[PDB]
């Protein structure tokens, strides 16, 4: 069976677009961003 594969939940490999299979990944895109709140 052809395998896309996945990562090891390894942030480096994720960022790098790697795989356990044969797919070449583009890379993670976005989940937005956050910043610390200023107080008050």
């Amino acid at each position: 069976a052809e395998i896309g594969g996945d990562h090891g939940y390894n942030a480096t490999n994720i960022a790098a677009g790697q795989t356990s299979g044969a797919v070449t990944q583009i890379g993670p895109a976005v989940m937005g961003m956050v910043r610390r709140a200023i107080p008050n």
């Binding site: 939940y9 390894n10 942030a11 480096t12 956050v34 610390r36």
Partner: protein, 260 residues
């Protein structure tokens, strides 16, 4: 991460179900698998909250003379000198707010505004006037106390949204904060694939093939541990692990309860 389940049923059994009860059993088996999956998802979220939640009645939230994490309604230190239930119950409400305050102390975004608790905890909350008064107790009216009409019991003081965990192992309650943005939750579920059906037959005996597959992923706000000015190497995973979040999530605290 992903999930996979099958029905693996025989055709003769389905045929008998039609003959006896008017049932095809295809939709029925499919419904069961899908139901279980949805159930497993909702539990996973709840369990991660409890996994990652900090200990209530601890640190800044602990009166020095107590047990560091459990509220005993029969124990003078926890009940803050209270007499019987009409006073003892109020003492828990007090501790809850203290913890909600701690939530703001650590998240930087707001005070706890929602509770997940056992049915017994809610029965208590619903039995009293939660406002500021001389004493309180009677038959529960404040919240739904059941487990079959809803999961949402009601709101304490008009401030905290209280829900019931019918599968709590003994009795405990988690308090936490959810801000207006989804990213202000601390904890989040991020689905990608849901309930894709599979169908076929197996030539060995040509019996029916049926099942489902899914893929979602969950995560943790980058600042959720609230105890660091930097992550290692500027690169992390937002996924839970013991090291990443057990007992570290700023958005929630939980305690065990006794004496109810």
């Amino acid at each position: 991460k992903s999930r996979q389940l099958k029905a693996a049923y025989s055709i003769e059994l389905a045929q008998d179900l039609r003959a006896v009860h008017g049932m095809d059993a295809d939709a029925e088996l499919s419904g069961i698998l899908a139901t279980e999956i949805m159930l497993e998802i909702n539990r996973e979220v709840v369990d991660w909250i409890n996994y990652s939640a900090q200990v209530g009645k601890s640190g800044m939230t602990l009166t020095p003379g107590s047990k560091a994490g459990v509220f005993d309604f029969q124990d003078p230190i926890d009940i803050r000198g209270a007499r019987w239930a009409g006073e003892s119950f109020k003492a828990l409400l007090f501790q809850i707010d203290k913890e909600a305050v701690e939530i703001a102390r650590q998240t930087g975004r707001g005070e706890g505004n929602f509770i997940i608790a056992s049915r017994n905890v809610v029965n208590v909350l619903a039995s009293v006037d939660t406002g500021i008064s001389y004493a309180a107790q009677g038959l529960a009216t404040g919240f739904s106390t059941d487990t079959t009409k809803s999961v949402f019991a009601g709101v304490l003081g008009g401030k905290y949204r209280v829900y019931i965990d019918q599968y709590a192992k003994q009795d405990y309650f988690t308090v936490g904060y959810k801000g207006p943005n989804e990213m202000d939750a601390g904890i989040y579920y991020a689905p990608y694939v849901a309930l894709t059906p599979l169908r076929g037959s197996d030539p060995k005996n040509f019996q029916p093939v049926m099942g489902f597959k899914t893929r979602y992923g969950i995560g943790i706000n980058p600042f959720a541990e609230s105890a660091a000015q930097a992550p290692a190497s500027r690169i992390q995973s937002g996924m839970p692990s013991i090291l990443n979040s057990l007992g570290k999530n700023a958005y929630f605290r939980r305690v065990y309860v006794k004496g109810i």
